């Protein structure tokens, strides 16, 4: 539990300098989990046995002075919607409880190759649908900064585990902000790479056109490092982009004077809280004091983010989840005597209220007579939302504004209010629709609850995001606070 607060960068060197044995690095982690998660509750399946085994293997490699891997002996947590071979992946749903993947996802493939240590899986909303992880069929994770508050959705477990010092880095999935929002709420660094930057082979789908895996760390630097270890095209993912340059650390540490930063006026709209707004405005000032040039611009179609997002996401969801019938795997209803029942009973009994809501909406949005009026329309709106960015990027390097309209909300506050629960995706959804890369870093606190600052960049321009993200981080961050909780 000692190096439980060290960054991936330092901890990385501590191992290379043989100042610490991999096996103890793990001993610490689990020691941490054992003491903190009972209260946080961010971890699902724990892979301790295997973890210990790998570390034991690493100690040898340490002595033999053969420490290869961008994340050698680095503890890692993985969202339970990302397939891990032999490790129970449930997507935090009854439907997949006990499910043991028979193949390895591409990100885990790469991570293992970099010799990272798999400590466990993180809790999440059921099937990435949700903004507070409260929909989990197993437990409700809590915000390390305020246990009376939520971690965020859907990767709440990933943001909380990192903030709670259970792991140095973790993976999450973003479809509409499921990485950035939980990041903002827990005041940690979250990054949803450009669509196509990180393979999707091995990611239990929610919205094939919006889904994307990303890293969550306690600081901008470590976050870049991890994204280097997972980025890269893959023959198992046809949509994976053929972009070789996967170095994101190069331009970190360089100044941002002259950097053209676009501040969408709609991002400081009416749906934004007062304290959140202030925080980001002082942020804007900070970005100025650093040299960057920030001027207001308009992302008109922003207001249509959430609506179009849901229609699209839900629709696809009404297709990606249809494979869950309890035939080849997953929850198999016992009270079924006919073939129709088996489907209608396994599915209903296995999915939770929210998942079924998306499905109903989606299935409807696609059905005959409504397809054009909802799905097609939403798709056309999506085109608008991207143009907005297209135009803006014609004169600006990056875009800035809050990540979430308000600080983290109370547990059970909006759990029974899906519509307001949705409003929280106001500032995130546009990015997934545009397929651009976004990143959130903490930039304030209101009543102890952290506020998120987001940086929206051009496709495959993550290096620039890290450049401006690191600069700002130097003027503000919560590095010293996680340690105190």
């Amino acid at each position: 539990m000692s190096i439980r607060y060290e960054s991936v960068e330092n901890l990385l060197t501590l191992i290379k300098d043989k100042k610490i044995k991999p096996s103890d690095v793990v001993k610490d982690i689990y020691d941490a989990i054992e003491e903190t998660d009972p209260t946080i509750k961010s971890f699902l399946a724990l892979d301790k046995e295997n973890a210990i085994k790998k570390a034991q293997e690493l100690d040898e490699l340490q002595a033999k002075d053969q420490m290869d891997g961008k994340l050698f002996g680095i503890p890692m947590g993985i969202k339970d919607n990302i397939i891990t071979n032999g490790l129970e992946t449930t997507c935090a749903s009854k439907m997949l409880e006990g499910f043991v993947p028979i193949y390895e996802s591409t990100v885990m493939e790469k991570l293992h190759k970099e010799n990272a240590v798999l400590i466990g899986k993180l809790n999440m909303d059921e099937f990435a649908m949700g903004g507070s992880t409260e929909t989990s069929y197993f437990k409700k994770t809590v915000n390390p900064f305020d246990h009376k508050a939520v971690p965020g959705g859907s990767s709440g477990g990933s943001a909380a585990a990192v903030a709670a010092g259970l792991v140095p880095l973790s993976l999450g999935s973003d479809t509409g902000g499921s990485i950035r929002q939980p990041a903002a709420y827990c005041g940690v660094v979250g990054m949803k790479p450009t669509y196509g930057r990180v393979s999707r082979f091995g990611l239990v789908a929610f919205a094939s056109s919006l889904d994307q895996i990303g890293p969550l760390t306690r600081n901008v630097k470590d976050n870049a490092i991890v994204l280097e270890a997972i980025s890269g095209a893959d023959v198992n993912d046809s949509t994976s982009a053929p972009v070789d340059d996967v170095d994101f650390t190069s331009e970190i540490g360089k100044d941002i004077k002259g950097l053209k930063v676009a501040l969408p006026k709609e991002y400081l709209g009416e749906g934004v809280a007062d304290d959140v707004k202030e925080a980001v405005q002082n942020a804007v000032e900070t970005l100025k004091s650093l040299g960057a040039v920030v001027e207001e611009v308009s992302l008109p179609n922003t207001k249509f983010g959430i609506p179009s997002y849901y229609v699209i996401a839900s629709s696809e969801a009404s297709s990606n989840l249809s494979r869950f019938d309890g035939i080849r795997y997953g929850y198999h209803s016992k009270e079924a005597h006919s073939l129709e029942e088996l489907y209608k009973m396994s599915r209903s009994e296995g999915f939770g209220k929210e998942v079924k809501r998306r499905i109903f909406l989606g299935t409807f949005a696609l059905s005959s007579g409504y397809y054009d009026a909802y799905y097609k329309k939403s798709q056309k709106v999506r085109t608008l939302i991207k143009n907005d960015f297209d135009k803006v990027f014609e004169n600006y390097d990056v875009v800035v504004g809050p990540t979430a309209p308000t600080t983290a909300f109370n547990l059970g506050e909006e759990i029974d209010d899906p519509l307001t629960m949705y409003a929280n995706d106001l500032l995130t959804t546009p990015v997934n629709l545009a397929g651009l890369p976004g990143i959130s870093v903490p930039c304030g606190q209101s009543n102890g609850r952290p506020i998120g600052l987001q940086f929206i960049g051009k496709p495959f321009d993550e290096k620039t995001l890290y450049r401006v993200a690191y600069q700002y981080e130097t003027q503000y961050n919560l590095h010293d606070v996680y340690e105190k909780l």
Partner: protein, 99 residues
């Protein structure tokens, strides 16, 4: 507005989701609210705008036609709750009352 029991049960059927009449009504409203929520897009001028199917501008991603032996039968059935003779066992009585 106007989301009948019928439609609600037609989608459920289209989704293979069992719903009791005591959930139907409830779902009729929820859907309606969500739909009214979805209705917002209509205030966006999309005249002559092409739908966005893919956000990434890739092209022709094909795979060379070269086979790769499949996994063992055991592996393919390892997670199936119901199996018989190396296959997935399932009901099938065709009666317009269960189907």
């Amino acid at each position: 507005t106007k989301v009948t029991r019928e439609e609600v049960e037609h989608i459920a059927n289209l989704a293979r989701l069992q719903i009791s009449p005591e959930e139907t009504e409830e779902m009729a409203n929820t859907l309606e609210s969500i739909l009214d929520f979805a209705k917002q897009n209509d205030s966006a001028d999309t005249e002559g705008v092409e739908p966005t199917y893919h956000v990434l501008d890739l092209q022709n991603v094909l795979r060379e036609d070269k086979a790769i032996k499949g996994i063992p039968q055991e592996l393919a059935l390892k997670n199936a709750k119901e199996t018989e003779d190396g296959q997935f066992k399932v009901p099938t009585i065709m009666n317009e009352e269960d189907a």
